[PDB]
Design a protein around this nucleic acid. Structure first.
Lengths: 136, 228, 127, 170
RNA sequence: GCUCAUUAAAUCAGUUAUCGUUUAUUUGAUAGUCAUGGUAUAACUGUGGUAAUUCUAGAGCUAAAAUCUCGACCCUUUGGAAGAGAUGUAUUUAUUAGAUCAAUGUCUUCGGACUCUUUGAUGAAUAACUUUUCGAAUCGCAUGGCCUUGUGCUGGCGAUGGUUCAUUCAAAUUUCUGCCCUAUCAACUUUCGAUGGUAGGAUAGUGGCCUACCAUGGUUUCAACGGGUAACGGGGAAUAAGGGUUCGAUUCCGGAGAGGGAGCCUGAGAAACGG
């Protein structure tokens, strides 16, 4: 016949952030029983005020920058076509949705919770003998 | 920017293009990505230039001073500082991997012959994948075999004929870059020979005969594969 | 008749007949070695190298000069309907004067550094 | 000049006449020099930057090989006899590959006498050639491309190939 | 680099194939065949013309070599040798090269015989030519060696060329599989060759690419061919949005043009509008 034999980056690309739904992991953090590395109090808040406190996504993505800056000893900056969205549309996602540093933008979503889990999604017990071994 | 460089999308717009050289450009990893970007030895692009002009780095027994110098699969990259020797080896997930080796292992490399003919005045010659053509080889050395290279001279100290049931690395295709030591060799239309591969978990995988690189016998590989 | 053209036909010789093997388990026939046709385009005894697609099919029309037509039937799979479609691909190929070809004649060819404007394949095996 | 763009002529099924692009440089073609027999002029062409080709336009001498003894002797050229592709070339005395000519028999004659000790049919060769040694005009063929190498190199007629062409010349 | 005019097996996407080709640069291989020839540009010196120019005029200057095999021999140790001969580079066409053995198999009369089977192991330059190409009037460190002692004779490591080959950056064709609507398009093509053969030409090269001559074929209800496409629609081309429900940006369109036609020249590359 014919076969492509083509290498793919997208199949090796991580898709963890696509199905990652935030309210599902908030159950995880209570049921993990590991500690979770909360920062200090005044180390959170943004500009003496105006910018709402910190998202826990925000102390993650800013941590990703500091982990990147300490490796390469250099800084990244005001590069404009990315900044005009990702500072406008992101800091308005704060004031529209975050309240006291905790996100309430989850709850107005049409992204439904089922489509991540979906009765384990793939590798599903579609036959009868598959159902006996999950009982095993 | 390609997949196997492990660059971030951050830190600057343009990707550092490779120079023409021994390896294929899509197979190549330039030395600018090798020093300041993955091994984190330098910070700026100019700092790569100061390392090369002072001749700290030597690749495969040559001085090799070029910023975008193409380094490829199975390349002994010897750094005179630290007395440490580096050998590039591809990683299963889609990327390259810098690897520590010894001084004796920095002496030899392996090389896939791509084409063998009869040169002028009745001289046999084989042409490796790194473009190292060598006069007077063994006539046992034929197409797709590996060649152990001395690197003090251009001489051939060991040779391994392609036979089914020997530990094979893949260079190309979808299932590029695993162990799996052979199932057999398939014939097909247009060539397109699919040298089948069954891994440590004994699962069939299919790439082209062009992608086949024999890295050892069933059991022993000739080089120190990175264990992890 | 061998010498029927306007020029004298001969092999370039790159027995009074020079042979070679096209390879890949395609054997030199009796008509190649002890024959009378010159045929510089023939896989054996000629000036072409079989590299590329070695394909098979059914010869459907033979009324040309020194060349024939292979019909290459197969089934397509449409993923949307989840049905099949019957298909074919009429491919003209050069035939050599060693293979007895009429309508029928299960055939095998090889890619031969394209000969003439559609011909990429030259007849190497007829069953 | 001449363009080799395969688009304009029809398809196998009859689709035709797109004119997707205009004529460009890599699909080029240049022109035949219908070379004649005269005082040798050498032409100059620059081809793909580094390489060159030799158009031939007037040719006096060329190198022909005697096939029986395997020796090669440079030949003065007189006239064109036969060519299969077009007989307009012969009546204009034009040299191409596989062209029958007439040559001087005396350079092959001088080799035959003082090296061996015999004359030429007044050490045995064919009968149809030995009668042509007294004529002073031997028949020879071209096996080079004067449009490319510029030389008039070829081969003299012997064997059954001699009998094929002399049948055409009667 | 900008601007004007819309392409349906074409583009594109991958895939080959380059033993069908060309390649500056990249890299890897690779050549035993006069302490200095002869020319040459100017600048300049001064005179002028011209409405004018990055316009112009005339004058005087600066044979020998070495290696391959043969070895008479002599001498037992590191072994060493007389003389017997034999070898241009590129380019162009023609010619030339590119059955066996060992035993462990086997038999035997125990001396050896046998390759049936096995095990291994060997095989598969001539003659000419060329608007004669190269064979270094190249550079840096080491400054040594012999005697007729002249600043003689000889001598190490590189570097750069340079021929050819390979490599890569390419480019050119090419293989194959994958596009939207349509029977109110059933025949289409040979009505710029359509299908092919052969020969020549042209080209970097394949080739109906072009042209002779020769055969009547090609694709098709499995939909050819034709038509519609507002083909700002489409390409996982590519990351993307850690709940805005499927959002983004990036890249790719396709073609033509530089007042209009047409012809040309350099260059690895342009049929280049900063000729």
């Amino acid at each position: 016949t014919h076969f492509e034999d083509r290498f793919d980056a997208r199949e090796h690309k991580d898709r963890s952030n696509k199905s990652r739904m935030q309210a599902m992991e908030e159950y995880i953090r209570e049921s993990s029983d590991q500690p979770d590395w909360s920062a200090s109090i005044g180390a959170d808040i943004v500009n003496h005020g105006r910018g709402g406190i910190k998202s826990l996504r925000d102390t993650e993505k800013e941590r990703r920058v500091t982990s990147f800056e300490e490796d390469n000893f250099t800084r990244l900056n005001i590069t404009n076509k990315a900044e005009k969205r990702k500072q406008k549309q992101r800091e308005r996602n704060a004031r529209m949705n975050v309240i006291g540093g905790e996100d309430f933008g989850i709850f107005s979503s049409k992204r439904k919770l089922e489509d991540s889990t979906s009765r384990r999604g793939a590798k599903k017990t579609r036959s009868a003998w598959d159902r006996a071994q999950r009982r095993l | 920017a390609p997949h196997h460089w492990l660059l971030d999308k951050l830190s600057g717009c343009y990707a550092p293009r490779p120079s023409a050289g021994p390896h294929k450009l899509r197979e190549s990893l330039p030395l600018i990505v090798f020093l300041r970007n993955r091994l984190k030895y330098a910070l700026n692009g100019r700092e790569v230039k100061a390392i090369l002009m002072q001749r700290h780095v030597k690749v495969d027994g040559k001085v090799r001073t070029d910023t975008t110098y193409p380094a490829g699969f199975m390349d002994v990259i010897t750094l005179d500082a630290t007395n440490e020797n580096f050998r590039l080896v591809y990683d299963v997930k889609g990327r390259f991997a810098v690897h520590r080796i010894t001084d004796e292992e920095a002496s030899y490399k392996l090389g896939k012959v791509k084409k063998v003919q009869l040169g002028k005045k009745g001289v046999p010659y084989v042409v490796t994948h790194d473009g190292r053509t060598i006069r007077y080889p063994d006539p046992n050395i034929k197409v797709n075999d590996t060649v152990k290279i001395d690197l003090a001279s251009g001489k051939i100290t060991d040779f391994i004929k392609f036979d089914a049931g020997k530990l094979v690395y893949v260079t190309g295709g979808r299932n590029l870059g695993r162990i799996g030591t052979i199932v057999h060799k398939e014939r097909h239309d247009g060539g397109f020979d699919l040298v089948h591969i069954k891994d440590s978990l004994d699962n069939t995988f299919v790439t082209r005969l062009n992608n086949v690189f024999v890295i050892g016998e069933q059991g022993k590989p000739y080089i120190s594969l990175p264990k992890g | 008749t061998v010498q029927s053209e306007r020029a004298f036909q001969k092999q370039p010789h790159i027995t009074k007949r020079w042979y070679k093997n096209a390879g890949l388990g395609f054997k030199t026939p009796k008509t190649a070695i002890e024959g009378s046709y010159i045929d510089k385009k023939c896989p054996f005894t000629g000036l072409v190298s079989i590299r590329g697609k070695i394909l098979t099919g059914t010869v459907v029309s033979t009324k040309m000069h020194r060349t024939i037509v292979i019909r290459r039937a197969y089934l397509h799979y449409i993923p949307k309907y989840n049905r099949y479609e019957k298909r074919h691909k009429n491919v003209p190929v050069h035939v050599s004067p060693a293979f007895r070809v009429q309508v029928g004649d299960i055939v095998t060819v090889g890619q031969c550094r394209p000969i003439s404007k559609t011909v990429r394949f030259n007849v190497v095996k007829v069953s | 000049g001449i363009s080799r763009d395969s688009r304009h002529k029809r398809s196998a099924t009859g689709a035709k006449r797109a004119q997707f692009r205009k004529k460009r440089k890599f699909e080029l073609g240049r022109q035949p020099a219908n070379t004649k027999i005269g005082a040798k002029r050498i032409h100059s062409v620059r081809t793909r930057g580094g390489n060159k080709k030799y158009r031939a336009l007037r040719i006096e001498t060329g190198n022909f090989s005697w096939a029986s003894e395997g020796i090669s002797k440079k030949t003065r050229i007189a006239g064109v006899v036969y060519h299969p592709s077009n007989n307009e070339l012969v009546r204009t005395n034009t040299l191409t590959k596989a062209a029958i000519v007439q040559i001087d028999a005396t350079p092959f004659r001088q080799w035959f006498e003082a090296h061996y000790g015999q004359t030429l049919g007044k050490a045995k060769i064919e009968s149809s050639v030995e009668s042509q040694f007294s004529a002073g005009r031997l028949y020879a063929c071209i096996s080079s491309r004067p449009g490319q190498s510029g030389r008039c190199d070829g081969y003299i007629l012997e064997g059954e190939e001699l009998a094929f062409y002399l049948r055409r010349l009667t």
